[PDB]
Design a protein around this ligand. Sequence first.
Ligand SMILES: NC(=O)C1=CN([C@@H]2O[C@H](COP(=O)(O)OP(=O)(O)OC[C@H]3O[C@@H](n4cnc5c(N)ncnc54)[C@H](O)[C@@H]3O)[C@@H](O)[C@H]2O)C=CC1
Ligand SMILES: NC(=O)C1=CN([C@@H]2O[C@H](COP(=O)(O)OP(=O)(O)OC[C@H]3O[C@@H](n4cnc5c(N)ncnc54)[C@H](O)[C@@H]3O)[C@@H](O)[C@H]2O)C=CC1
Ligand SMILES: NC(=O)C1=CN([C@@H]2O[C@H](COP(=O)(O)OP(=O)(O)OC[C@H]3O[C@@H](n4cnc5c(N)ncnc54)[C@H](O)[C@@H]3O)[C@@H](O)[C@H]2O)C=CC1
Ligand SMILES: NC(=O)C1=CN([C@@H]2O[C@H](COP(=O)(O)OP(=O)(O)OC[C@H]3O[C@@H](n4cnc5c(N)ncnc54)[C@H](O)[C@@H]3O)[C@@H](O)[C@H]2O)C=CC1
Ligand SMILES: NS(=O)(=O)c1ccc(Cc2c(-c3ccc(F)cc3)nn(-c3nc(C(=O)O)cs3)c2CC2CC2)cc1F
Ligand SMILES: NS(=O)(=O)c1ccc(Cc2c(-c3ccc(F)cc3)nn(-c3nc(C(=O)O)cs3)c2CC2CC2)cc1F
Ligand SMILES: NS(=O)(=O)c1ccc(Cc2c(-c3ccc(F)cc3)nn(-c3nc(C(=O)O)cs3)c2CC2CC2)cc1F
Ligand SMILES: NS(=O)(=O)c1ccc(Cc2c(-c3ccc(F)cc3)nn(-c3nc(C(=O)O)cs3)c2CC2CC2)cc1F
Lengths: 331, 331, 331, 331
Amino acid sequence: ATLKDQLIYNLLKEEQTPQNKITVVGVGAVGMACAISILMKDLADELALVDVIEDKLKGEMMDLQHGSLFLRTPKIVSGKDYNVTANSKLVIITAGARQQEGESRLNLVQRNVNIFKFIIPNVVKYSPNCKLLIVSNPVDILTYVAWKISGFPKNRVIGSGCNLDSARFRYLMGERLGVHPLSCHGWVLGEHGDSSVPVWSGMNVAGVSLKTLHPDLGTDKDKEQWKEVHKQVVESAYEVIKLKGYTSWAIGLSVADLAESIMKNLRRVHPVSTMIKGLYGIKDDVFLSVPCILGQNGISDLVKVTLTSEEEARLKKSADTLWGIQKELQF
Amino acid sequence: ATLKDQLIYNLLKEEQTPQNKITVVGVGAVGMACAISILMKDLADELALVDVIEDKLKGEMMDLQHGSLFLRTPKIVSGKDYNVTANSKLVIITAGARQQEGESRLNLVQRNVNIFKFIIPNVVKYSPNCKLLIVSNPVDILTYVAWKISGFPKNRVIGSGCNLDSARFRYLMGERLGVHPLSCHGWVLGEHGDSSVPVWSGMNVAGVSLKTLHPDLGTDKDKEQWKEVHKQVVESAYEVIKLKGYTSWAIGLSVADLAESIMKNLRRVHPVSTMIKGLYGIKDDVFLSVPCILGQNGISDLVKVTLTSEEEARLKKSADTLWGIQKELQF
Amino acid sequence: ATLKDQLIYNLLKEEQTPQNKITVVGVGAVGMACAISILMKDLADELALVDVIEDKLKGEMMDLQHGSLFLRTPKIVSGKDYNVTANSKLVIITAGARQQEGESRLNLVQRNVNIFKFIIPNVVKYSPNCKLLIVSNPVDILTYVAWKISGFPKNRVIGSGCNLDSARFRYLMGERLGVHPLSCHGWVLGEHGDSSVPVWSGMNVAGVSLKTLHPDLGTDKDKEQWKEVHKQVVESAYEVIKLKGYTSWAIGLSVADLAESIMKNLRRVHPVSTMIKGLYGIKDDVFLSVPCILGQNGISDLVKVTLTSEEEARLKKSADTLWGIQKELQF
Amino acid sequence: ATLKDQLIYNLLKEEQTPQNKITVVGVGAVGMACAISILMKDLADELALVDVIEDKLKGEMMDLQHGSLFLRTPKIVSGKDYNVTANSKLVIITAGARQQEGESRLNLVQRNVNIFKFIIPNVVKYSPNCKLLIVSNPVDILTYVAWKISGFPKNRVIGSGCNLDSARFRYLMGERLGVHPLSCHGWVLGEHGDSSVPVWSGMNVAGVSLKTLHPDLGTDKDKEQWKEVHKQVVESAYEVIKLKGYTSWAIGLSVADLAESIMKNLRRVHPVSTMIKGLYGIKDDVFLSVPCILGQNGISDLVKVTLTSEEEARLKKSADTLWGIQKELQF
Ligand SMILES: NC(=O)C1=CN([C@@H]2O[C@H](COP(=O)(O)OP(=O)(O)OC[C@H]3O[C@@H](n4cnc5c(N)ncnc54)[C@H](O)[C@@H]3O)[C@@H](O)[C@H]2O)C=CC1
Ligand SMILES: NC(=O)C1=CN([C@@H]2O[C@H](COP(=O)(O)OP(=O)(O)OC[C@H]3O[C@@H](n4cnc5c(N)ncnc54)[C@H](O)[C@@H]3O)[C@@H](O)[C@H]2O)C=CC1
Ligand SMILES: NC(=O)C1=CN([C@@H]2O[C@H](COP(=O)(O)OP(=O)(O)OC[C@H]3O[C@@H](n4cnc5c(N)ncnc54)[C@H](O)[C@@H]3O)[C@@H](O)[C@H]2O)C=CC1
Ligand SMILES: NC(=O)C1=CN([C@@H]2O[C@H](COP(=O)(O)OP(=O)(O)OC[C@H]3O[C@@H](n4cnc5c(N)ncnc54)[C@H](O)[C@@H]3O)[C@@H](O)[C@H]2O)C=CC1
Ligand SMILES: NS(=O)(=O)c1ccc(Cc2c(-c3ccc(F)cc3)nn(-c3nc(C(=O)O)cs3)c2CC2CC2)cc1F
Ligand SMILES: NS(=O)(=O)c1ccc(Cc2c(-c3ccc(F)cc3)nn(-c3nc(C(=O)O)cs3)c2CC2CC2)cc1F
Ligand SMILES: NS(=O)(=O)c1ccc(Cc2c(-c3ccc(F)cc3)nn(-c3nc(C(=O)O)cs3)c2CC2CC2)cc1F
Ligand SMILES: NS(=O)(=O)c1ccc(Cc2c(-c3ccc(F)cc3)nn(-c3nc(C(=O)O)cs3)c2CC2CC2)cc1F
């Protein structure tokens, strides 16, 4: 018989399920950044990639496979068929349409909704017990959409939300203070992006409230213009998009961080997008970022942050906006 | 005074040199793959990025910076000016021209040589004691060019060479055997790419020579066509380029692996491109991949692999080709 | 209500089964070396400790728990009762007695057998699907004992075996060559310790057979005395026992390496102790180290090393020794 | 010539200075816990061990060396002579005596002082530019002693201090809240151990002050007895000492955490023991733990925590205690 059979005696033909499997749907720059970050943090024993562009998908898959010598994830697979995604613990959706010239925002949102209508049922068929982590924008709306289509309980449908926005905030805060972002604490809540809410009262280093040291923190009156930090959380994303065309690395790392908490059941707290009806004064079925405890069953718990009247009003405004958009969408 | 000054008492204003600094020149897909792989393996305390496209460079830099919370490399910098590269231990060149329609190979090679004529003197000015790791293709020729321009001793000028080719080989070998590539041993030497030489005699698992088990290994007569494995080492690269347009992930991981050996002085053995005159029968100043011991002073030693007459002839043919191309190039 | 309930809204009131649980039985120096190594490679989401000495057990557990901030293993538990071990994927046995005044080694072996008669049934009750990794000495005999008491198929009963011995060999080989042990290839097979067999023909760097370069490799007359390398594999262990009283760190790291391959399903090849009847000429039910493919279902495959007549005779001699001891033991 | 010379061509005949060297003085349980933690986080390219007990020292060194295959620290050395420590970036002192029958704690403190009188001059001769990290107890006093004997500026003399105490606090807080210690924020300052000060006002999750939610936090009358958390920070250490005889693992991990910040220049904030005269109302030359920014030049900056009158009084009391002990010690 063969060289293989001369070299190797096989006892065991038992099938084996993947035990720590992650799927990434959508292998654009964001999806691949998520994939490489996950691979290099050894979060999965199997990584599955899905796209509709078959050549891109296969080529990306093969490129990762060629680096297997340098990795500790023994199985990397891909396909347009969702059977490759079977038995995933965690499925990350980074699939999206490209805005065309002369296309409205609303049309693009609806094109992304329609992509989700095809993706989510297929994911659910093959991984009924998975957690869904939604990265695709508009992320708060598409997390709601994924929830409604999947039929999953709300603990298993999580939007990356303001995890990245909060990471940018801690980055910017660290630059101003000369401290590593790990030691700089501050929370951006609500909607990902423009309408995000910096919670000034929780901003601290070593448990020291910046707001109590500096009462003008977060106001227009501030000599030091600390509001500019939050403004830059928003503008820095626009800046990266202008300079290189898109963002990928930061979101990839942030998603790997959330994945770590889920896959290893860490019960760390992250600002992610969750079904917030009945809390913080919100009365409609919408997803907004608040600090959530993440582990193996998704969101098990959330932190009830004390907001100023102004902060709360901004969240309710966001919720009204999201409800309005949600009802003018089609499904 | 300021909130910073209220929060933080500064004692120490001493300047501080970077102690474990790496530079990547050329932030295309390869350069960025190298950067992310290095960042996620904590190989540097400072990463510097250089390109000629200022917007791309800045946007990439900012995108990595936004993920700082998730990293243990506290300083990421960039610029077109090489003063940002000062005091690097290791400088990785991934800078390259794009082939235009109707452009010869030779013209492209010369365009890459001319890029090196601008890069290498600038690198050397600011990091005279660095190791140079050349990734740009044609890698064997451009490693020779970097050596000649830099004036560095040959131990400090290293071409990524067949490190990636050998990684692909061990990947493919592992697929055939059902074993992790880490446990599958085999060496591809000589030129990166088409003319690479698989050394059949060193192919083993657990110290068991495949050639001794299967004497037809590497021949045309082989029922099992193990030559196809090496053919696929070549074709798989062309395949990835066809499918996704380029390769990035595998090379990025392979470069991070070489960087690990250098930065941590591991004295591991890797198939990299080194000045091979006077060895394996070669009589001209050319760079080819052989197994080299890598650490803090670059290539300190190399392994003398016993080659068949045929293997040796293929290397000498390669050396003659490289010498011929080298003399028809301009510097 | 409580501060917890004021801070935290609970979504989900669920039990939570451990997904990547490892148990260490025996928290002496070897057990705790295994524990810390596993904790610092993030191989488990839950670690369970068992001993008969309650105070030591509890104190060790608490000491690890106090380092939780610095680890990514969210649940560390301990008890005398094996219910704390329930649903382990991997159970590592490092439990044993200490040789008393006037006690033969064989008397001690029987006391260790009797320890296993208490441990193994308890482990099996609470983790019927686990892999068993036996570390306690005499390791080859006690792996057989664990197999017989457990009733487990042979893929799921693994002795740490010569993984450590082979690591020592590659260390010593690296000292002689000035190369990292990772790049120095060589296998020690058979029994852990004194009777271990160095396979000279597999010794290589970069696929270059040392035996072919140096035909006297492994002979007594060798100018360079390379047999001393294997002798030192044995004597170095006795040396550490003499100088420090025991060994712990190297075995801890070796066991973490095996655990990595199992928990991450890597299908790497390791020289571990497996039920070898019917292979390598062995005709009795014994455990000896040969190169095995390790993954999530334990030992899936064996590499068939080509041995000299003498190497094979040494394995069969070992098998006859183990069979003789196994028959004169009481169970 | 030799098999080495047949296998390997030497390019470069150079000495090689260590670039990222760490020394551990005192290879008891705490020293070796520090060593293994540092080795498994790849913080050093060379580790040097020192003790006065030669056999134990050599045996421990050899045991680590046998695990080299599984590590990425290529050089591990040991000796009684401090020439093995030359050119260390970081030197960690874990050396100490054991309390004898009829011996006061103060008598023991003086014996530990006398140990430092021998150690520190020797460390300084061979690594005049190192940072000193003092772990030996009484840690605050012995950090002062190391400072006085060394003549080093205060940025380069660091006591492990309350980094461990704060880790215990966050562990216990996490047990009460059902959240990972990483997401539970809270500071223990002042002296390591009994007299440590919990700063109630900094206790938070997600920037939410527990003190503001629960005003009785830190009072004796508290319904929920949150003072018990701090009491347990102290008692849990006594508990581990009572149950196991000593503590090692948590301190090992805490020291590796400090070492990480220094070796990688992270500028994270840690509660470590620093020369605090002129701050927090302290008027004598003593070392107490406050939140310090740690990097490659040791302590670069201090965070100025807003303390209650009572918290500040407790620090000053500690300073008066330390000053009194320091004056009645002989050197
Ligand atoms: N939540 C956050 O913080 C951020 C999220 N994003 C979002 O991530 C999304 C992806 O971003 P990029 O990679 O830059 O976009 P991209 O357009 O490069 O990639 C999208 C990918 O989705 C795939 N796709 C489209 N329809 C599909 C379907 N039915 N099934 C599977 N795949 C499908 C495309 O074929 C394409 O490869 C975008 O919506 C972007 O806004 C971007 C950065 C931050
Ligand atoms: N040795 C190996 O195993 C392999 C090496 N490669 C090589 O890596 C090179 C880079 O590959 P890609 O990122 O795909 O190409 P790319 O064209 O996307 O990026 C090249 C980058 O170099 C920059 N550049 C050009 N001139 C420069 C200058 N004077 N200074 C600084 N930067 C300059 C460009 O501006 C551009 O961002 C190519 O030559 C490619 O063949 C690709 C994969 C494997
Ligand atoms: N396979 C290999 O390469 C190596 C194996 N070893 C073996 O590891 C074993 C443990 O070594 P050490 O930690 O040095 O010895 P140790 O005597 O310090 O620790 C053994 C522990 O076993 C526990 N124990 C005894 N009976 C038990 C029971 N019924 N249930 C649970 N725990 C029980 C003891 O109470 C004790 O805490 C020994 O047999 C030693 O020879 C150590 C060196 C390397
Ligand atoms: N800062 C903190 O949070 C903690 C500090 N510790 C302290 O760590 C110290 C060491 O603890 P253990 O390992 O349990 O004690 P140990 O007594 O087992 O180890 C101490 C080692 O110091 C060595 N030694 C004594 N004199 C020396 C000299 N002149 N030169 C070099 N080495 C010398 C001994 O020979 C011995 O091997 C103790 O003072 C202990 O209290 C331990 C717990 C936590
Ligand atoms: N709360 S919500 O679901 O209704 C919602 C509405 C609108 C947006 C805007 C938006 C879109 C977006 C793309 C496509 C659409 F069809 C609609 C919105 N993408 N996107 C990106 N962010 C990043 C990054 O790196 O942070 C890169 S792109 C952003 C944020 C913008 C950079 C500040 C976000 C958002 F969550
Ligand atoms: N010994 S040498 O220096 O003279 C030399 C000559 C020719 C080539 C061909 C070549 C070029 C190349 C690009 C530009 C030029 F101007 C000339 C050659 N790139 N390149 C890539 N490799 C990869 C990858 O992932 O392996 C991606 S692209 C390849 C190899 C091809 C895929 C098999 C390589 C080589 F080393
Ligand atoms: N094939 S077998 O199962 O029948 C068998 C028989 C005898 C021994 C001898 C033995 C014992 C031993 C302890 C207790 C007994 F009751 C019997 C034997 N322990 N032990 C240790 N090794 C280490 C280390 O670090 O390598 C530390 S201790 C050794 C190996 C010796 C140092 C080289 C090993 C062995 F596998
Ligand atoms: N501020 S100071 O420098 O003056 C000072 C004085 C007294 C002590 C008490 C002390 C001693 C001690 C050992 C020997 C002496 F000679 C004096 C004191 N050790 N030690 C340990 N801690 C641990 C652990 O794991 O936390 C293990 S032992 C402790 C703390 C106690 C368990 C909570 C600490 C302290 F920092």
